[model samples]
Structure formats: structure tokens, C-alpha cells
Target: EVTPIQQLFLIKELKPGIARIGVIWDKNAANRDEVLPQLQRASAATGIKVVVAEVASLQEVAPQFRTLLRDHQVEALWVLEESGLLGQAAARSFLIKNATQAGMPVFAPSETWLKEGACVTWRKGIRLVVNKAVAEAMGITIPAKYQDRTAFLAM
Candidate 1:
């Protein structure tokens, strides 16, 4: 589960300022319920609007995402990284490709999406590393205090 602090950090890293965040979920997944409160908190704290798209099953993800893009209500897409509903690796690639094709940002599970071409991600370990790489790519500087505590991939 992503903590509130971590979510805030990610929002700050992305720096989308009032950006619309898209969330794709399998309505039947227990993980979706578990993460909803945290997501809500993140939305409230960051003032980011969440556009939720609930799918009856994982098979619907790609199509639903296409619909989301057509609607143009979301600037970025966020999905649970390891939900048993779909194969994460394939889904990640699909999301990245689609988002890139549409010129929208995709963030899945956590920062893992960064390596998959997401604009930013903020999960543990490599996700954090990739997020820092993303930060540098956007020309943002990390504070020394944050750097000392984090071993995120360098610029």
C-alpha cells in the first residue's frame, strides 16, 4: 500500500498542479477497496482530481483507457501495480504505449511506470530511482536533505 506521504511526494514530483488523474480499477478486486482510502487522501491533500473508471474485469482495461483518452478528462493514468486482475508487465507496456500514443502520462502501481516511460512514479526502490531520473529529465533539482536519505537514480 502507498502511504499518504509517499503519494504526496509523487504528486510533488509530477508537479502537474491541479492535473486530472485517471484511475483504472477492476471493481471486484479487494485491492481496489483497500487502496481507495489512500487514493482519496492523496487526492484531497494534493488537490488532484481523480477520474475513476471501473472495469468489470481486467480484459476491459485497454478499451476503457482508450475511452478515457477520448474523453480527455485525465492528463495521467494510475493503476494498481500488482493487482491479480491482470498481468502487470503486459498491462504496463500497453498503458505506456497507449498513453504515449495519446500524448498522456501513465503511472501504474507506483514508480515502475517511470521505466515504462511514465512522466513520474513514486514507489519504493527502483520506482523511486526511476522517479529521480524522471525529475532530472524534467530539469528539476532534488534537495540535499532528500538526496541524503534517498538513493534514487541520479541525473
Candidate 2:
């Protein structure tokens, strides 16, 4: 879907210096086989690097990310649908703090993550997400499409 493309689009434009992006998914909770290739295809045109981390639980999410940043030239974070992050409030809070403190863009495919500080979510009219504060928290200009709330996030 174009959502993934938009995900990569913002990263490319905002973090021009970065050549890689990261995808965090739970092998036990989400559909990795379906989600992973989409990210790869999304970056196919951008020529950016994407590293998918398949974790067994939510606790593994942030640590793998810390290492991902330490090891790669990554510019953003993509949190796919996983029970560990979705089902565990503690995991979500911990990850939100860790990831955002790093000043990286964090996104998912649903609105469930918005209140938890997700800059962008990919479901329905929530695509562009909410609040300019968190949206611009990473220093990237949120292209103004999410403001409409019904415009489907052309930005």
C-alpha cells in the first residue's frame, strides 16, 4: 500500500542523511510474512535500507531497536501489528518512551498507537495521526495532510 511508501517518503525527505529504516514486529503476535515484504517493496524505489527485527515479545522491541540504531544508519521506526506491543500496556509505554527519546519517527497501522505517542498511524482517517506537537516532535514537518482528519493524509 501507499501508506508504507508514505512512511518511507517522509523518512527520505526529512532524514536525507539516513539510508536505512527499521521495522519491528513480533513473530509471536503479528503476521510477519505478510508485513515484511510490503516494507521492502515500499522502499524499493527509494533505494533505502530496511531492517526487519522479528522479536518474540514486546520486551524485545526497544532493545533490538537500540542496537538497530547503534548498528545501522536508520532514520525512523515502524511498529507493525503485534500482540506484545498492542496487548501489553507496559510494553507500549516503555517503547514509546525509548523510541521517541531517540527522536525517531514512530508509526503503526492503526489509531490504537496515537495516544501512546505514535506520530502516524495507518488506519482510515487516522492515517496522518493527530497533534502537531508529537507529529513534529522528530523535527520533520508533518506535511499538513493529517489536519483535515478526513482527507486521508495526502501529506
Candidate 3:
């Protein structure tokens, strides 16, 4: 079953070099304070790492996101469903393009981003999720026969 936690497991599958999964959230949105801690516990439980950046607005999204990718050692990034992020198409497009160019796989909260260079985005009915080309481009691998079982996926 795909855990309702959704994006939670992607980091746990690979470790050490890919331990750090970057997360960005809008501080002022209708977001959760406790979700981060819960995900942190989940990460630590699996012996993985999480790097976080809190963004204040559209302007800060690019800067803080770069902070996670540029120098923070994040092997991948997850964009939280912060209103400041999903609310602005320009913000999402710029961030996705920049991350893709940097050769980083990014998981955002919507499907449109999937077509727009984001590594994975979820929609209906147990769709296997992953961007194999991007993953391979960055040296990550998905085990054989893994895609079938994933009903869902990774790279």
C-alpha cells in the first residue's frame, strides 16, 4: 500500500549519500507545525536525513530552495504543499526549472509540475511515481521488477 504519508518513503529507500532530502514550506500558509516532526522521526527511524528551509513568500522561495540545493548537501528535494508555493505558477516553474538544471530530482504537490520538470507528482489511482530519466541522470537506480510492485515507483 502507498502510505497515506505519500512522499515519506522516497528518502528511506536510499541512504548515506542520499540521506538528506530537502524540504521547503511556507511559514505563513495553512500548514502544519507537527508534520515536520513526524516526518523527521520517520527519517531518523530509517537512518536517513532531512534538510529544511522555511520560505516567507514567492521571492524567498527561490533563495531558500537554492540554499537547500546549492550548499546544503541535499540529494533531493520535496516541496511542501505550502500555499505560497502552489499558489504561484511562476514560483513553481522557476524553482522546478532551476532544480532540474542542477540535476536534482524534485517532488512537488501537483501533477502539472511532473510535466514541468519535477521528478514526481501524484494524481489519482495508485499511479506508480518516479522520473527514471532524471533519476538515472543523477545516478540513482530503481531495482528490477520494482516498478511493477511499486504500483508506484522511484529512481
Candidate 4:
């Protein structure tokens, strides 16, 4: 399991001032029990509250997500593992639109989310690197190191 403190540090460096992280989980996902410890550690390290919104089916996602927003406590959204079961493209679009409407940053579980539309995401490779192409297209400044990385997509 990845250390929560490490996750928190990466999150702070990339997306600072985020107070709450949203996660969606399916109880049936394989090895669900194993992932919770890391999540707990991350919460303890960052003091960032978690908003767990369970979804038994894809149809249930939007409504449960709305509940999270209505509660008005979550400052940001973090899509966790197993959310892939929701259909990657659809889930990606949903999160992007939801967070945009709420005026909050959304962090995807992996690089795919960053590729899809998230403001930032933590995954394998350079730590906390912004999506330069997307950032520039959005009129947001692209950090130099991030821009220098050949892996970054050019807008």
C-alpha cells in the first residue's frame, strides 16, 4: 500500500488548499479491504476529510455525487480506484463537469483523468506534474519543469 503521508505531500504540492477528497467505491471491487489503510493514512497525514460516496451501479453515481456536493463540505473531488467500473470515459466526463459546475478542482485517480480533463492528478512518473497542454488551453500557466518534460502533451 502506498503511504498516505506521501500521497498527502504530493497532493499538497500539486493541488494545495484542498480540504476534502471525494472517493467512489464499489463494495464488490476486488481487494477492497486492502486499499483502505492507505486511504486512512492519507487522511491522517493531510488532515483532509474524506467524503465517501458509494455507488452500487453507474446509474447511482450522479445522485450520490450530488449528495456530496449538497453537503457542501467537500472542497475537491478525488476519484479513487475501482471507479473504473463506472466506465472510464463517462466517469471522466461526469467528474469534469461536476467539479467545473461546482468551481472546485477535481483530481483523477490516474494519468487517464489528467488526460481526460482533471486539473491535476498523481500517478506514476514525475511527481505532481501539471497537464501542460490542458493548462495552457485553459489559460492557466504551465510550470516550466512540467513544460520541459517530453511526456507532456502540447496544446
Give the alpha carbon lDDT tens digit for every residue of 16-131 in model 2: 56677777667775466766787788778788888877677666866787776777646777776645654567766666677688787666555666666766665442344443
Q: Rank candidates, TM-score, best first.
A: 3, 2, 4, 1
Q: Which pairs of residues clash in candidate 3, taking residues 3 or more apart in a chain or in different chains?
A: 128-152
What are the Cα lDDT values of the candidates?
Answer: 0.61, 0.64, 0.65, 0.62
lDDT score for candidate 4 against the true structure: 0.62
TM-scores across all candidates? 0.69, 0.74, 0.78, 0.74
| Residue runs of model 2 more than 4 Å from their true location after superposition | 1-18, 84-86, 125-127, 144-155
RMSD of each: 4.0, 4.2, 3.6, 3.7
Clash pairs for candidate 1 = 81-109
Clashes of each: 1, 0, 1, 0
After superposition, candidate 3 runs with Cα above 4 Å error: 1-6, 14-17, 123-127, 149-155
Which 10-residue span in candidate 3 carries the lowest summed lDDT? Answer: 146-155
Q: What lDDT is reached at residue 140 by model 4?
A: 41
lDDT of candidate 1 over 113-148, digit per residue (tens) = 666666554544423434454444443445444554
Better of 1 and 2 by TM-score: 2
Tell me the tens digit of each residue's lDDT in model 3 across 67-87: 988889787777767356555
**Which candidate, 3 or 4, has the higher lDDT?**
3
Instruction: Kindly indicate the candidate among 1 and 3 with the higher TM-score.
Output: 3
